[PDB]
Structure 1
Amino acid sequence: KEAYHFVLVPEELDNDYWRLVEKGAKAAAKELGVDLEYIGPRQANIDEHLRILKKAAAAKVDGIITQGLTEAEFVPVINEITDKNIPVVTIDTDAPTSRRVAYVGTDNYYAGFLAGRALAEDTKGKATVAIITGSLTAAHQQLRVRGFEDAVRQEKGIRIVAIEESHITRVQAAEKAYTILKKHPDVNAFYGTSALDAIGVAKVVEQFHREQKTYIIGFDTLPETIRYLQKGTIAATVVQEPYEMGYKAVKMMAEIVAGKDVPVVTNTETKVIRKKDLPL
């Protein structure tokens, strides 16, 4: 009996969030006697991401765990991998129209919906919102935006005046905040859907001395996010369970190759945390 060899491809190797996924994935792998190879782009890059997927598939590994990041490029690659009878578990971002066997990650539509609810609650239903999103093509970003929009649609005192892409860098989130605040000086609320968006926004808001008049809600728990939350510049952030999705993704791949029944979608929890919830 040879050990199962699984590949987990993170969006970015050196990233606090994915290192938490790696920890959970390696904990489950060790617990099951599974060889887990954790490889991806050192810096997020779609083309090296796809290239590492197709390489792992050509190695006849027993299963591949990955984001279904974009419909256009990742659904074909997931299906291509599935056509070699290698099962794919999606993690963090689903591709529900692909032939991936199972998904483990946040309900991204509903993370954004809870963010809309939290913004409406905290602003007492009155806000002029700008949205910073990592990209318009990444499936989880799209869902987080759409969920927020649906949540606030009937909030008569809320209107969304801008949506801008950060390309998941802190510097470009700041850039877009400079552009938005210049163009829409009535903006008193920012919603960021990737891990550095609120952080980039927070810097610009503080530069213009607008923190006391600006509500900021972002995603995840990076150190600068916790700092701005303790300081008051960021009012809230949506917290995921990267360790748990790493752990559950590996355990579910093992169930799949063992022939057991597994659900198609497993959603790890999501929570809107504010300053009062710190420490985590």
Structure 2
Amino acid sequence: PIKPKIVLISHIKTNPYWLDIKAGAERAAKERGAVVEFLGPTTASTEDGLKLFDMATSAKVSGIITYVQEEGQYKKKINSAMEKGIPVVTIDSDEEDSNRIAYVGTDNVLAGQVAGKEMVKQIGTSGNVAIVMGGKNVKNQKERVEGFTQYIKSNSNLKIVDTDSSDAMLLEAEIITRKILNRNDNINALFCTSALDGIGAARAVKDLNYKDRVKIICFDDLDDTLSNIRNGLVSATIVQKSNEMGYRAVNIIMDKIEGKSLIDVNVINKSDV
């Protein structure tokens, strides 16, 4: 017999963060009797994500769960799908100005503020910070940087002296970090805002030494990040409930289909790992 098909569109398909979201979606789908089709580009592209969203709309799938890379850019296609009877859920970045039935993911501005509070605990109220973000024009990255900046401006005298982008690539995270440490005199800490940024930054700090003149606060609980926390290269990471996002999003879609009726962030330090 044939099952409802739910389309899940990721930021980056190969990434281990999205694989964890996928796992959560598959768990919910098996429980609810649906099939998940998991899609995404190799390199981050709003354009490519929208084409995939357009394909699912045309195919009139039973539901779409989509990442939102850029503010305002998904509204048109999301609303068009909703209008055509396809329930749409946004995941791990929202499109607030759209008629999607629900957003499942982190409050990203808040997560930034949380990082900001932890940054003050880590190095105090005075010093220089540099930011490595996963794409300059990526929505949930800008939101994380926004919350962070706001926080340390209200609650410290920490100076952000450099902000650049990894495009959420691992190698480019290392290189942009190495470039930031060079070209800046006294950096005390790095804030890394997507999953691979912290791993790339740790590589760049370990390679110049600067372990430990430079602390790292990064995002997510990937294996190498947890390992870098145990080994002291990373001081704190901000952890999201990725598996739970995938799980909850499928159940919301299946609830809508069947006519039935903001996930916190956690700071992890070496004592926690």
The TM-score normalised by the length of structure 2 is: 0.94
Is 1:276 the counterpart of 2:238? The answer is no
- 1:36 shift after superposition: 2.2
Could you tell me which residue of structure 1 aligns to residue 242 of structure 2?
A: 242
- 1:60 shift after superposition: 0.9
- 1:131 shift after superposition: 0.6
- 1:12 shift after superposition: 2.4
Could you tell me which residue of structure 2 aligns to residue 264 of structure 1?
A: none
**Alpha-carbon distance in 1 for matches of 2:42, 2:189:** 33
- 1:57 shift after superposition: 0.9
**Alpha-carbon distance in 2 for matches of 1:39, 1:135:** 20
Could you tell me which residue of structure 2 aligns to residue 146 of structure 1?
A: 146
Q: Which runs of structure 2 are paired with 1:98-113 in the superposition (5 Å)?
A: 98-113=98-113
Could you tell me which residue of structure 2 aligns to residue 219 of structure 1?
A: 219
One-letter amino acid of the counterpart of residue 269, structure 1: D
Could you tell me which residue of structure 2 aligns to residue 258 of structure 1?
A: 258
Q: Which runs of structure 2 are paired with 1:167-186 in the superposition (5 Å)?
A: 167-186=167-186
Q: Secondary structure at the match of 1:13?
A: coil
Query: Any conservation in 2 of the 1:174–1:201 contact (CA below 8 Å)?
Result: yes
- 1:96 shift after superposition: 0.6
One-letter amino acid of the counterpart of residue 152, structure 2: V
**Alpha-carbon distance in 2 for matches of 1:36, 1:198:** 30
Q: Which runs of structure 2 are paired with 1:186-205 in the superposition (5 Å)?
A: 186-205=186-205
Q: Which runs of structure 2 are paired with 1:90-129 in the superposition (5 Å)?
A: 90-129=90-129
Query: Any conservation in 1 of the 2:128–2:187 contact (CA below 8 Å)?
Result: yes
**Alpha-carbon distance in 2 for matches of 1:156, 1:146:** 15
**Alpha-carbon distance in 2 for matches of 1:234, 1:219:** 10
**Alpha-carbon distance in 2 for matches of 1:273, 1:156:** 22
- 1:134 shift after superposition: 0.9
Query: Any conservation in 2 of the 1:68–1:75 contact (CA below 8 Å)?
Result: no
**Alpha-carbon distance in 2 for matches of 1:56, 1:15:** 22
Query: Any conservation in 1 of the 2:188–2:215 contact (CA below 8 Å)?
Result: yes
Deviations 1:49-105, CA, capped at 9 Å, x for gaps: 222111111111111001122124322322232232212100111111122110001
Query: Any conservation in 1 of the 2:72–2:95 contact (CA below 8 Å)?
Result: no
- 1:42 shift after superposition: 4.3
One-letter amino acid of the counterpart of residue 140, structure 2: H
Query: Any conservation in 2 of the 1:162–1:180 contact (CA below 8 Å)?
Result: yes
Deviations 1:208-256, CA, capped at 9 Å, x for gaps: 2111111100001222212211111111111001110000000011122
Could you tell me which residue of structure 2 aligns to residue 15 of structure 1?
A: 15
Q: Secondary structure at the match of 1:186?
A: coil
Matched residues, number: 273
- Cα RMSD, aligned residues only: 1.7
Mark the runs of 5 or more structure 2 residues left unpaired by the alignment. Answer: none
Segments ≥4 residues shifted beyond 4 Å:
none
Q: Secondary structure at the match of 2:155?
A: coil
